[PDB]
């Protein structure tokens, strides 16, 4: 799925968590799992990517709003 903007990928699903890497707009990401975290533009859903860090799902163009795949473990 493409990211919708330049999008931070963080060590935890929080906008205060450390930035591991930043994807340039349109970069293809795969979703390992989904969880909840900071509310970003109305969505508290966060996606763990192929790199093991978390992005705000609002900015991942999947067509889905709610969690739709494997839930991340605690
Ligand atoms: Zn930023």
Residue numbers in the entry: 1 to 74
What does the paper say about this structure?
Muramidases are N-acetylmuramide glycanhydrolases which cleave the β-1,4-glycosidic bond between N-acetylmuramic acid (NAM) and N-acetylglucosamine (NAG) in the carbohydrate backbone of the bacterial cell-wall peptidoglycan. A ‘domain-walking’ approach, searching for other sequences with a domain of unknown function appended to the CWBD, was then used to identify a group of fungal muramidases that also contain homologous SH3-like cell-wall-binding modules, the catalytic domains of which define a new GH family. The properties of some representative members of this family are described as well as X-ray structures of the independent catalytic and SH3-like domains of the Kionochaeta sp., Thermothielavioides terrestris and Penicillium virgatum enzymes.
Further, a complex between a triglycine peptide and the CWBD from T. saccata is presented that shows a possible anchor point of the peptidoglycan on the CWBD. Structure comparisons using GESAMT revealed a similarity to SH3 domains as mentioned in Section 1. The peptide in the TsGH24 fungal muramidase SH3-like domain is bound on a different face of the molecule to that in the lysostaphin complex, which is in agreement with the discussion in the lysostaphin study: the peptides in bacterial SH3b domains are found in a location remote from the canonical specificity zone of the eukaryotic proteins. The triglycine in our structure is bound within the canonical specificity zone. A thermal shift assay using differential scanning by the fluorimetry (nanoDSF) method was used to confirm that the interaction with triglycine is genuine rather than mediated by zinc ions. The results show that at pH 8.5, which is the pH of the crystallization conditions, the thermal shift is present for both treated and untreated samples, implying ligand binding. The structure of the complex with triglycine provided an additional argument in favour of these domains binding peptide bridges in peptidoglycan, similar to what was observed for the SH3b domains of lysostaphin, which Staphylococcus capitis and S. simulans use in their competition with the other staphylococci.
